[PDB]
Design a protein around this nucleic acid. Structure first.
Length: 1011
RNA sequence: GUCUAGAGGACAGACGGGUGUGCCAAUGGCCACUCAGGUGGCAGCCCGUGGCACGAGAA
């Protein structure tokens, strides 16, 4: 529970110090640059890499450079020999590196310890299995090995004098330790990035091994195709099933025009979604063997290989090396909490007033009149912050003791100041050499109540395993009965009630509603379990106990402010984007006209034909003045179409395109000026319904702007007026920042949102006035997240649910959850979520979603409410909210010890007894436990029956398997627990879901009855 | 009214003081050099009916 509080030093009156701060900074960095340069040098090896990747130093260059330093060193401390063989001296240097960085050889080390131990023999003449290394070193005349930076030429600074036969000032220590700490990190980072590349190469190389199977020629053909295309695949190639089915009728040695026509046929059926015409058109020629000759699958299979192939192409072998620079690569001056050894500081409460604090620096430095000398005790004011107002001091006599305070949470925590770092914006750093803002980053160590009670881990972590970090969750089932009596039920409802009862909250993440949470309490069945106000509660059996069951307390929908829906609201939302929708629709055709330019042929005709007369330029969404202007240049192109020569035509477009490009620039310029600075209504206080943030829609909307501007500009460079070299600077530096902070702010609030609920505090507006957290319900020990991908499973969640934002959001929340959750001891756990939205809890049988993403009723589409068959086969249909039910599923999965082996099975054809069978993918038990030496067979080929007899790489399991799917090689089976859908047998996957559609699609369609 | 999870339920109806980081309709203004976008130089908002969060560090 280290929280970091950054504060701004009002280093305003004293510019004697401000320069000092800056001088410190530059100075520390030089120190670290010194040692760190020694260390990089200090391994006899190894090639050092720096991208502009090019390797800055070999190999020998490090070795040749190091010897000189050493031999120069031997000369500096008078040596009467021996001076080691160069070769053997090198070994010692290597041996020393490793002790200095244990991580280099995959071991462990503490920079605090290794700095404490090693500096004095290294940097000191002592006068005014490591010990082999040091004794060996002095034998060779290399003590001290390295200069001490502050007591040196390099430092332009007058420090406080050195006495008492100590050769190292405190700072020489901090700089050394930083230098080690840094290498230790770098060494483990370089090893990881180097490894990932090989696993990419090795895993990629599998796909080449299994899939292409001695048919090089096809591969070469596409290689040859791609270059044909770039001369003057991915998942563009959307209609290949259909385009390729139809072509089969057509003949090789046949006219192309017949081929082009089929592409046009599928474009209309499948528009919007179609692969580039050009890819297909290119396909049409005598090169159609790639489609033409089985496998047909090959391009679709290949497209994946190209996915992987790029990734290694875009992935790097070595972690690049840069030495710190004050300005380019800053590292920060570091301090220590009062006590402990090195430079220290003291937080002063209310030093200059109430709520006005300051920081006393034992050992700050200051420059006067261009002379930089050291100073002893300095206090610096500090801008008042809300964050500071939170913390408190427990004992004046022992400083560094603070009460860290949370209100609602009803806890008051205890703790201490850790050490600080002084740092500024990285934007300013180039500027500094001048009033540039400076902050102090101060760590804060906070003791959870469990940490305070002296408990090593809280009482209930005994009962819940977690794993993989990526915490997985499993319950210990014996221990629930034990546990509960020791900690039985209570009124206690705050942070207080943590010991008292056992509770789990399950949270599902979704775009419309940020979290849907489910709370279940564990109580004995056949006790008061029947006692319910009014109706009996809903529950789940637990695997361990026949008198223990999980009672559901409440299920809720947690929404960030932006979530609410309304007529007034929807209106405002569509206005916001109206211009942007138009501008993107305008550019699309502006980019189309360019296509008319060709040069390469075929492109010119296809592009030309579509634009002019079919159906027409789109009135529906364009901005009108453009609509006219386009129609103008549109007529103009037509008149001159037969008449003009190829140049007259090509150069007519260029000039024609300029005409519309320029007009847009005013629209763009106009619009950016409005969004960038304009009147808009901005809320005050708390407004229940608000317009965008913190929703995904709002975040999305800001991205979309950025990602348009990147294209408006990019267009100009490709075709149109501009040609310019691209400088390092990226787009929309202001916007990029905004967005990222929106995003930061989103998920931090999303944690606190989820985190408050577990503790069962609700935020009640009245008066609002003041709305304050008031505790409501007893707290929940454990929090259940769901798991993340890759990969995206067929028939679990629409893609609408899956986009970089959702993935990013998932990742962000988990992290902030485990981080936020720490202070008050809440476990954070995850549960496989696959088909947690597809099946019921607890029929529980497969379903579909309805009605909506007159007054509508019952229609079926993805989102937002689940419906399923019950008990069974009409029977009846059971209706449930969609994301509420995913959460409830998570709970069932916990309590019953779910493994996905229960529902799904990946397997491929092999023959065991002169019979073809599906033989499972055994990785990894429970699946292995259940299904080892079981084998599946069919008579139908749709429904399957079971007869008797180290790497998991899940991310890569589906990918190798989806292609196996493309051939007949692999089949997936899925099964209903309920026995409703197929009699409960394993059914091939695709049929299984259709049977599911037909089952509910049918009653619903039928219920309509008469016209 | 409909639906199950029985619940915050989902769906319909002038003076004085401050300015740690950001979000919430929340992406500063002006001029000059090479419609977007950089690069260089110059000079609002809250509090005494405004809300919300916040470990940071490195890439």
């Amino acid at each position: 529970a280290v929280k970091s509080i950054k504060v701004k030093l009002r280093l305003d009156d004293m510019p004697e110090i401000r320069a000092g701060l800056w001088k410190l900074h530059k100075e520390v960095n030089a120190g670290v640059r010194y040692y760190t340069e020694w260390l990089s040098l200090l391994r006899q090896e190894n090639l050092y890499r720096r991208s502009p990747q090019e390797c800055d130093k070999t190999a020998e260059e490090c070795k040749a450079e190091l010897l000189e330093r050493l031999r120069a060193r031997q000369v500096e401390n008078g040596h009467r020999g021996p001076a080691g063989s160069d070769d053997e001296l090198l070994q010692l240097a290597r041996q020393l590196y490793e002790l200095l960085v244990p991580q280099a050889i995959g071991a462990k080390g503490d920079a605090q310890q290794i700095a404490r131990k090693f500096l004095s023999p290294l940097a000191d003449k002592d006068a005014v299995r490591t010990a082999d290394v040091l004794r060996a070193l002095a034998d060779f005349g290399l003590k001290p090995l390295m200069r001490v930076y502050t007591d040196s030429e390099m430092s332009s600074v007058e420090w406080k004098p050195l006495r008492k036969g100590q050769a190292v000032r405190t700072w020489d220590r901090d700089m050394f330790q930083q230098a080690i700490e840094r290498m230790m990190s770098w060494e483990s980072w370089n090893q990881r990035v180097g490894q990932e590349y090989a696993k990419l190469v090795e895993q990629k190389n599998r796909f080449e091994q299994k899939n292409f199977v001695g048919q090089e020629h096809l591969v070469h053909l596409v290689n040859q195709l791609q270059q044909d295309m770039k001369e003057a695949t991915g998942r563009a190639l959307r209609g290949s099933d259909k385009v390729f089915e139809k072509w089969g009728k057509l003949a090789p040695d046949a006219p192309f025009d017949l081929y082009d026509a089929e592409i046009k046929n599928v474009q209309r059926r499948n528009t919007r979604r179609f692969g580039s015409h050009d890819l297909f058109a290119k396909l049409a020629e005598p090169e159609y063997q790639a489609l033409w000759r089985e496998d047909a699958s090959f391009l679709t299979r290949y497209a994946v290989y190209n996915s992987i192939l790029r990734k290694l192409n875009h992935a790097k072998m070595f972690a690049t090396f840069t030495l710190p620079d004050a300005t380019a690569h800053p590292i920060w001056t570091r301090f220590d909490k009062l006590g402990g050894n090195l430079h220290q500081y003291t937080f002063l409460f209310n030093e200059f007033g109430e709520r006005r604090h300051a920081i006393r620096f034992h050992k700050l430095l200051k420059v006067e009149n261009g002379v930089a000398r050291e100073v002893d005790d300095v206090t610096v004011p500090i801008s008042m912050s809300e964050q500071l107002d939170n913390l408190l001091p427990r004992d004046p006599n022992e400083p560094i003791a603070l009460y860290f305070r949370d209100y609602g949470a009803e806890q008051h925590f205890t703790g201490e100041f850790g050490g600080a770092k002084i740092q500024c914006r990285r934007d300013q750093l180039a500027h500094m050499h001048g009033a540039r803002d400076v902050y102090l980053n101060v760590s804060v160590r906070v003791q959870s109540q469990s940490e305070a009670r002296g408990e090593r881990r809280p009482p209930y972590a005994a009962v819940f395993r977690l794993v993989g970090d990526n915490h997985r969750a499993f319950v210990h089932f014996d221990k629930l009965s034990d546990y509960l009596a020791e900690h039985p039920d209570d009124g206690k409802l705050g942070s207080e009630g943590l010991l008292s009862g056992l509770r789990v909250m399950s949270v599902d993440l979704g775009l419309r509603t940020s979290a849907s949470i489910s709370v279940f309490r564990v109580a004995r069945k056949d006790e008061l379990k029947p006692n319910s106000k009014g109706r009996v509660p809903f529950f789940f059996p637990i695997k361990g106990n026949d008198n223990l069951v999980a009672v559901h307390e409440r299920s809720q929908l947690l929404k960030l402010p932006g979530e609410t829906e309304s007529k007034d609201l929807r209106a405002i939302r569509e206005e916001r984007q109206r211009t942007l929708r138009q501008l993107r629709t305008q550019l699309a055709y502006l980019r189309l006209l360019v296509r008319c330019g060709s040069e390469d042929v075929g492109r010119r005709e296809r592009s030309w034909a579509k634009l002019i007369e079919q159906p027409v330029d789109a009135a529906n969404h364009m901005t009108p003045d453009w609509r006219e202007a386009f129609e103008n240049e549109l007529q103009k192109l037509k008149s001159l179409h037969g008449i003009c020569s190829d140049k007259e035509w090509m150069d007519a477009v260029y000039e024609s395109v300029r005409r519309v490009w320029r007009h847009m620039g005013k629209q763009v310029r106009d619009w950016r000026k409005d969004v960038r600075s304009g009147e808009r209504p901005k809320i005050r206080g708390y407004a229940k319904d608000v317009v965008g943030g913190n929703s995904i829609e709002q975040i999305e909307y800001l991205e979309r702007q950025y990602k348009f501007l990147k294209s408006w500009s990019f267009f100009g460079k490709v075709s149109g007026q501009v040609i310019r070299a691209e400088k390092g600077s990226r787009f929309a530096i202001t916007l990029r920042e905004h967005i990222d902070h929106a995003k930061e702010d989103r998920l931090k609030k999303l944690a606190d949102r989820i985190i408050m609920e577990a503790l069962g505090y609700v935020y009640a507006l009245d008066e609002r006035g003041k709305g304050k957290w008031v505790a409501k319900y007893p707290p929940c020990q454990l929090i259940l997240l769901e798991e993340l991908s890759e990969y995206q499973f067929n028939n679990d969640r629409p893609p609408s649910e899956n986009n970089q934002l959702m993935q990013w959001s998932h990742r962000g929340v988990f992290q902030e959850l485990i981080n936020q959750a720490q202070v008050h001891d809440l476990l954070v756990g995850t549960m496989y979520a696959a088909f947690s939205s597809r099946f019921d809890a607890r029929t529980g049988a497969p379903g579909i979603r309805c009605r909506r993403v007159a007054d509508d009723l019952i229609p079926t589409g993805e989102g937002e409410i689940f419906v399923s068959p019950f008990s069974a086969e009409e029977g009846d249909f059971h209706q449930i909210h969609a994301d509420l039910n995913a959460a409830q599923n998570l709970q069932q999965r916990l309590w019953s010890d779910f493994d996905i082996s229960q529902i799904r099975l990946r397997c491929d054809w092999g023959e065991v007894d002169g019979e073809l069978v599906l033989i499972p993918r055994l990785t990894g038990k429970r699946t292995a436990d259940s299904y080892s030496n079981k084998v599946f067979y069919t008579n139908t080929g749709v429904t399957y029956y079971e007869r008797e007899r180290e790497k998991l790489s899940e991310e890569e399991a589906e990918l190798l398997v989806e292609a196996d799917e493309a051939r007949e090689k692999s089949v997936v089976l899925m099964r209903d627990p309920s026995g409703i859908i197929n009699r409960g047998n394993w059914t091939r996957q695709k049929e299984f879901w259709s049977m599911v559609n037909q089952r509910i699609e049918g009653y619903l369609v039928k219920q309509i009855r008469s016209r």
